[PDB]
């Protein structure tokens with residue numbers, strides 16, 4: 084058993100010569116050599132079984148990724164675990180080895196407009212597949228976008244994903260915490276549980292802005308502060324958009340604010356392509372019902388060099404629609420059985 088930074092990695096004998104990469108949800112990510120396929124791979128160690136929410140995140144991801152097959156979604160090549168439930172303490176998920184993630188890339192690298200266009204195209208192409216499966220990713224952010232050496236992009240981490248449920252999306256003011264804060268749509272803080280596809284388009288718009296400037300566009304320092312940053316750039320919502328918000332507490336909070344003017348995108352991003360800024364505006368639209376959808380975004384003039392609906396596939400088998408951790412562990416054991424001897 085090889086150890087990496089005081090952490091056992093029981094992945095032998097198939098996977099050897101381990102190297103640290105970073106941290107996932109319930110454990111670390113390493114690279115390793117695959118002695119069967121004679122290539123290096125990435126391996127994520129997960130230790131979720133003490134906690135019901137961890138088991139939930141682990142089961143969601145495994146169930147989804149084993150059904151999905153798409154060029155812009157990183158797949159599961161192998162799952163390593165003990166042969167019995169009694170002996171199962173950790174799970175190792177083996178995936179293609181990528182070169183970097185967009186979070187690390189944006190810390191030091193300026194993106195050319197050609198790279199921004201290609202990265203955005205690939206994010207939306209993968210997102211089209213996800214949404215066609217009636218699935219919401221719900222945690223899109225640069226660290227969940229992986230790049231290989233030729234800048235092919237893959238979406239990672241479905242542990243926060245859910246099946247879309249727009250009829251049950253409404254909730255009260257200041258109750259929801261969906262997504263990582265900086266990528267969270269304004270309606271999460273106002274009246275939404277994050278159960279509609281527009282949640283993901285907002286996150287993509289935040290990622291686009293960050294690719295244009297190498298800094299987060301809405302860097303809220305805490306929960307309600309996130310809405311301060313959003314409104315500081317978008318300006319005050321229109322009467323029509325407020326009439327959309329029937330919840331009285333959320334609407335009255337917005338009405339209590341002083342009038343704020345919109346900051347023009349081309350003042351925030353003076354070197355950006357004007358077509359990129361037009362698409363950015365449509366993704367970062369306050370009203371989630373008016374916000375552009377993934378297939379419309381793919382057809383936007385900014386992406387005309389890449390757009391090809393017949394090469395933008397959808398899912399064959401969409402997902403249609405309280406468990407103690409003991410039952411979740413059994414479910415995880417069952418879902419991973421296909422990779423055993």
Ligand SMILES: *[C@@H]1CCOC(=O)c2c(O)cc(O)cc2OC[C@@H](O)[C@H](O)[C@H](O)C(=O)C1
Nearest residue numbers: 105106107125180181182183184226239240
């Ligand atoms: C993604 C989990 C899989 O991540 C990877 O496979 C991965 C590869 O292949 C290369 C590099 O450089 C990073 C990387 O993941 C880094 C993770 O920390 C990632 O950002 C994210 O946190 C995650 O776990 C989901």
